Write a protein that binds this ligand. Structure first.
Ligand code: CDF
Ligand code: CDF
Ligand code: CA
Lengths: 225, 227
């Protein structure tokens, strides 16, 4: 079986911002290029930014242009995955056993260690979520007016990426959902859980920051001196 | 009836940052300054560690000279609940508690609280049991009861990050903290968690993503850039 990388960069964007010296997207793709087991690295880019992602690849990673496929992502992260898996299928026809390690372009501090656990866990599980023990106190409210519930904070995890699973599996489970369900089931791991599937946990790092806000940008800058 | 600010501002065992310089003033000072903005808050009761009581007194004498008779320094407890107990009992020494007297509890290490947040807490406390300043979770929260594979990914749209202010009536909190045993108090160290699990109507207050909790070093670095 093959292993692929699925970089999600189709968002609406922070990943084309310079971090230190190079775009966050380039930082993120970098960690995947060394990994011997990863066949191609496939990036879902917003259809408008595709060409600008390739100029970026040429300018910043000319040694790996062959290892990278830049493809049009979709309206929401799940769709981007669909599109990434489709592009994988265009490179080599998917077998039941081929794998995708998906990851946010805006997470530029993922470690080869994480990547390797995800790949490694996926052997004897349906899918793999990368998480860390929750820091904030989490409060629930179905209405958004008063507290409907407070979950037990000793079993809560802050969810990050990689999210790793077989390709066919995603195309099957995601495929079988009405639009209304897709709109509610936005997390890729959620879909596996509700379909009653075994999703194991990969140890993430509190440092696996996801860069969404101008505050996240500062935290990142201080992490690279 | 009365309105008090209860500033949870002391303890060890966890190096907590409330006495560090932010811009020019210690963080705690920034925090107290927000509550002096509110004309309606009677006194501002600050709950510091035993060793730090006088250090805090001086900080008021040095940085808040005029609003010094507005502020009352007191000893904290082992946990913030024991501290709220101590803040409450300090107020009862100042002015005997009237069943409706509310306390606006707040982390001393959250100096970016606005008056808007404060006023929403006094207001929402009117016809609710308690108030919890809150913001929409930005992170997907994942539940796992076993610890190796997931048992639940709640809907994120319905999930919230806890902040402070947390507001309530003084007698109301004491009467619940009482019925709890010494081993019972351990399992639920947050104040709003007591109200909910003893079935009470505690409403949400729109918080702020800028309402940072200064705990780590990078947190201090973010904070310094914000002011
Ligand atoms: N259609 C989409 C939407 C978002 N994304 C984004 O997914 C990652 C970050 O997720 P997000 O915070 O935008 O959304 P979510 O919180 O993961 O649902 C980014 O690396 C990427 O920009 C994507 O690749 N394709
Ligand atoms: N007995 C205690 C213990 C800690 N605290 C802490 O509660 C406030 C915010 O919490 P923190 O940032 O120290 O973090 P933690 O809640 O102690 O994990 C601090 O101002 C103070 O150090 C308290 O008010 N009373
Ligand atoms: Ca009443």
């Amino acid at each position: 079986h093959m292993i692929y990388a699925g970089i999600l960069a189709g968002g609406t964007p922070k990943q084309f911002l310079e971090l230190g010296d190079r775009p966050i997207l380039i930082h993120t793709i970098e960690k995947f290029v060394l990994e011997p087991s990863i066949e191609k690295i496939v990036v879902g880019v917003h259809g408008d930014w595709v060409s600008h992602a390739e100029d970026l690849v040429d300018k910043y990673l000319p040694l790996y242009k062959e290892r990278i496929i830049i493809t049009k992502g979709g309206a929401d992260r799940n769709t981007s995955i669909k599109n990434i898996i489709e592009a994988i299928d265009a490179y080599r026809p998917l077998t039941p056993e081929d794998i995708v390690v998906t990851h946010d372009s805006v997470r530029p501090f993922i470690t080869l260690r994480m990547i390797q656990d995800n790949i490694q866990l996926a052997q004897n599980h349906d899918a793999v979520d990368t998480v860390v023990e929750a820091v904030d106190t989490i409060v629930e409210s179905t209405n958004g007016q008063f507290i409907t519930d407070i979950p037990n904070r000793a079993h809560l995890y802050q969810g990050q990426t990689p999210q790793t699973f077989r390709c066919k599996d995603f195309m099957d489970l995601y495929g079988s959902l009405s639009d209304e369900e897709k709109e509610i089931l936005t997390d890729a791991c959620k879909i596996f859980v509700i379909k009653g599937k075994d999703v194991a946990l990969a140890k993430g790092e509190y440092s696996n920051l996801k860069i969404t806000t101008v505050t996240d940008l500062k935290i990142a800058k201080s992490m690279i001196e």
